[PDB]
């Protein structure tokens, strides 16, 4: 799961991105689930820093 893939997937679900975990990127293999860290839930979505405001966790498939 590259930083590239995580960044591109965020733009894929930009409207859906939320405090809860996202669908797993992948249907065959391994990817990542992303969420907005509770501490940053009232931040605009264009102002979100990819490192310090996004919680990322791998998903096995």
């Amino acid at each position: 799961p590259s930083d590239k893939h995580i960044k591109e997937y965020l733009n894929k679900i930009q409207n859906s991105l939320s405090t809860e975990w996202s669908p797993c990127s992948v249907t065959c293999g391994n990817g990542i689930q992303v969420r907005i860290k509770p501490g940053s839930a009232n931040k605009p979505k264009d102002e979100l820093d990819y490192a310090n405001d996004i919680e990322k966790k791998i998903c096995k498939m």
């Epitope: 591109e8 965020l10 264009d46 102002e47 990819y50």
Partner: antibody, heavy 120, light 108 residues
């Protein structure tokens, strides 16, 4: 159902100043990053400035740093660019572009542009 | 700021497929976008995030980004595709950055 119409282009003396406007309609202006992109005649596109949904985050290309100042009015859904101490290289067609993307960003919608011409 | 470098001109006959390259060392690690600017009009985003297309853009336009070369392929080229094409990157860690532009020419 989404449009961006720039205004304020004209002629100005070197060292003078101008202020461009971009009037946005058809999308909730207050929750989108806006940008200015200019293009000198016969040359390529050049990013100039960006302002975030609220105005907390602001950056400029080194080209225009210190002389230009971007601002937005989210009540009237308008974007502005105050350009001071203009030089010849500032001559170009200025576009206002809507920004999209979080970590890697793009310009999805563009206005037709306004021409700024700095000449003695 | 990431520097992108595109060929100045690119020619091809009608109905053939044209490839417009956007080069940079390890550009494959960056997410590239593409714009069409026909003479007098505003740019139009044809492809974002390397290969995804916005609504309305025909399937003829395709983007890939491998190693040191991003490529916007245009298949079954029509005369109307005659325009300028600019690749662009903007990772949130730096500022935006455009290529020099490639003038597509459909050969008559």
């Amino acid at each position: 159902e989404v449009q961006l119409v720039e205004s304020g282009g004209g002629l100005v003396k070197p060292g003078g100043s101008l202020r461009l406007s971009c009037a946005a309609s058809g999308f909730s202006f207050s929750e989108y990053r806006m940008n200015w992109v200019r293009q000198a005649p016969g040359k390529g596109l050049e990013w100039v400035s960006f302002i975030s949904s609220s105005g907390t985050y602001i950056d400029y290309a080194d080209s225009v740093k210190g002389r230009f100042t971007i601002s937005r009015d989210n009540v009237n859904n308008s974007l502005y660019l105050q350009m001071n101490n203009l030089r010849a290289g500032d001559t170009a067609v200025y576009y206002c572009a809507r920004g999209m993307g979080i970590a890697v960003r793009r310009f999805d919608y563009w206005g037709q542009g306004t021409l700024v011409s700095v000449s003695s | 700021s990431y520097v992108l470098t595109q060929p100045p001109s690119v020619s091809v006959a009608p109905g053939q497929t044209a490839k417009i390259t956007c080069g940079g060392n390890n550009i494959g690690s960056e997410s590239v976008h593409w714009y069409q600017q026909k003479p007098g009009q505003a740019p139009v985003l044809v492809v974002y995030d390397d290969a995804v297309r916005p609504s309305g853009i025909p399937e003829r336009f395709s983007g890939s980004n491998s190693r040191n070369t991003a490529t916007l392929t245009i298949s079954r080229v029509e005369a109307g595709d005659e325009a300028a094409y600019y690749c662009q990157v903007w990772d949130s860690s730096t500022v935006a950055s455009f290529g020099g532009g490639t003038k597509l020419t459909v050969l008559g």
